[PDB]
């Protein structure tokens, strides 16, 4: 049993998690550490994860008038800015208004 945090992945034994930006590809063995490969194009993971697939970045729909503040990394999502003429509807940032 047991398992130290940010490592805690336990299945017969204690494996480590994936650093944010990496996703799981193979479990660990009695004598092999976890797999983890870095998140693909358009994808990210901000957690020490035991996840198969990363998530797609936020988008920022221009049909709703959204710019991009920070183009997301494999570690952080895309920071969704609002139009350079329009104010954001709610504390970052789904609907935009005048």
């Amino acid at each position, epitope marked *: 049993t047991a398992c130290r945090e940010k490592q805690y992945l336990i299945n017969s034994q204690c494996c480590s998690l994936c650093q944010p930006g990496q996703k*799981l*590809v193979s*479990d660990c*063995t009695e004598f092999t550490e976890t797999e983890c490969l870095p998140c*693909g*194009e*358009s*994808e990210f993971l901000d957690t020490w994860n035991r996840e198969t697939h990363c998530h797609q970045h936020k988008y920022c729909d221009p049909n709703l008038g959204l710019r991009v503040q920070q183009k997301g990394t494999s570690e952080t999502d895309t920071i969704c800015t609002c139009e350079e003429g329009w104010h954001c509807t709610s504390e970052a940032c789904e609907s935009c208004v005048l």
Partner: antibody
Amino acid sequence: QIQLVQSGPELKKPGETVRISCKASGYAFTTTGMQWVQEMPGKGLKWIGWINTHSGVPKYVEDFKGRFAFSLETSANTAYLQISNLKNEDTATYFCVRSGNGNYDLAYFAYWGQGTLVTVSA
Amino acid sequence: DIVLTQSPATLSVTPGDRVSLSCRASQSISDYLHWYQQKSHESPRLLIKYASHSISGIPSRFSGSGSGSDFTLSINSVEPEDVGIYYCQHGHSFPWTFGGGTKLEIKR
């Protein structure tokens, strides 16, 4: 190394059933979930779905769901796949697949069985 | 359901050549693409995982590239043994689909 040995070739009349075995060896059977693939004579490959070698919970791809079914005998390191109400369209070669190393999704099939040809005929 | 279009359907190549077998998805499948080699009277063999990553035992020649919608399996110096059918398969969302196959025909 890791090995996937399958059952012999079967012939069944349409509307009957058939079960194909898969005897995994070279690893901890319950650590890695078992999957199944259907190779159509000549034609392409279709992923049937997968089973959890720990919980026993299967995820079947829609077309295959209802007629195809994953069953396993842990004690023997053997996973099975049984096709119910056999259709003529089911005459294909069946493969049990493994990998990655977890009991999750993982589309990369690093380990394949030898194949089991099912023949649906009167 | 994703659609993995593998063109050319067939490809006749002399040995030693550089080869580039293509795979294009309907949606963007990010880096969830895998490559399989199926020789005659043999089960498939995983060559490439997650579009670019090398498989333990696969000859040096084979290498893969690509992201999102267009991917490419490249055989550096085509050998007469590399005669088979090559499949691409995705991971980015249930269910998983394979491709056409690109039959590789060695010239002599």
